[PDB]
């Protein structure tokens, strides 16, 4: 059975794209092995439904990630942070897209991404919650607004809640992580007024002889 040593990465850090997990991009496993030595080194985040997400990725068996052309009209892309530096360079989750002010401007976004393939798409995205109100308006002109991610089966509304969070590597703020599955013939539709940590594409999601295990045993 094909073993993938998670080393210093957790399955979710490997998923999201934590800089020190770039080696895990698009990898497969019959068994993913999480080590107790693992850490995170990127923006502070919270995955409500963490355990569920970890489980469904583990039994899918791979992190095959396919990029997609989302049309983010009038908004600055590829934001980064001190909390997620690659070396001395500000970086971010390699599968997430931090949208923000472009020339002191932020328009509401309304984008769709139709699934016309023969398989299910897994979209991982999030929502940024600023520490202060100044932080809100600097990054997204507009005050706290909503994120609405809808399909023909699901519905996911998130309201950003501004407030001081626990200090993690330079930041007193946090990102909420959410996931969506889009069936063939279904369509991913994102309406966002701001605070959206956008998806860069999708994971091909399946199910099979695939799992995950926690262990510090030497793979030999």
């Amino acid at each position, epitope marked *: 059975h094909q073993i993938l040593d998670g080393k210093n990465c957790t399955l979710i850090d490997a998923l999201l794209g934590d800089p020190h997990c770039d*080696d895990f991009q698009n990898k497969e496993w019959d068994l993913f092995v999480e080590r107790s030595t693992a850490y995170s080194n990127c923006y502070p985040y919270y995955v409500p439904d963490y355990a569920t997400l970890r489980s469904l990725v583990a039994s899918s068996g791979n992190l095959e990630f396919t990029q997609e052309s989302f049309n983010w009209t009038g908004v600055a892309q*590829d934001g980064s942070s001190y909390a997620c530096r690659r*070396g001395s360079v*500000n970086s971010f989750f390699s599968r997430l*897209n931090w949208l923000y002010n472009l020339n002191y401007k932020y328009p509401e976004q309304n984008v769709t991404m139709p699934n016309n393939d023969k398989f299910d798409k897994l979209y991982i995205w999030g929502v940024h919650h600023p520490g202060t109100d100044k932080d809100q308006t600097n990054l997204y002109v507009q005050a706290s607004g909503r994120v609405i991610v809808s399909t023909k089966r699901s519905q996911q509304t998130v309201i950003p809640n501004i407030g001081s969070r626990p200090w993690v590597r330079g930041v007193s703020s946090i990102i909420s992580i959410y996931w969506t599955i889009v069936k063939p013939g279904d369509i991913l539709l994102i309406n966002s007024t701001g605070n959206l940590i956008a998806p860069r594409g999708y994971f091909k999601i399946q199910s099979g002889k695939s799992s995950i295990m926690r262990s510090d045993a030497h793979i030999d």
Partner: antibody
Amino acid sequence: QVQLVQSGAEVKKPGSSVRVSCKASGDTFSSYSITWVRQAPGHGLQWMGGIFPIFGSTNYAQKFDDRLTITTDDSSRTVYMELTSLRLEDTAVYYCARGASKVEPAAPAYSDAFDMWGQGTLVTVSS
Amino acid sequence: DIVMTQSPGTLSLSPGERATLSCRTSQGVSSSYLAWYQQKPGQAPRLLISGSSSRATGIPDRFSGSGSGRDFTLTISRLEPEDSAVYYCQQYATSPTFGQGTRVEIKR
């Protein structure tokens, strides 16, 4: 611009190891990515791992994983391809290549179009 | 694993004619992550097209790129004797994969 310059052709026996260099420009090395791609009969083109010398960060293909190492030398602007535990089907021409887009700190494109290419290095594996 | 299937295997046309090359992918590939290459016997691949229709620096305008989803195209408007080479498509939406190649012969 750079005109990537690789090592010369090699001959290795099965179970041995190569190191194939690539010499880049200051710009190519510190603000672009370097990729290895190999070619053979029946293997039209095979993307092997890639590197961002600027970060030292890597991504390898599983096919060559825990065998293929991609390292750099910042003082010479060179990227090295160390394929270990050589197999007869590793006989191929190994090219280095540059990522067409420039480095994006938030999302290092290890998967890209390949702008400039090295001359190719034939590694023959045989006893 | 995105499979790239090129059509035809071999194409033979005289100078001045238009060459049309086709590429079929196993997954829907965004047209902003697809490239075309030229490889003349013994050379390294030369980037012709990136972003499906964006022409690379130092490439002639007779080289045209098109396509979307799974159906992509390379058009060579006015063949020269210099265009005798193998052509390749590549997707870069996931870890880079390439086609089997199309061999273009120039008639004489």
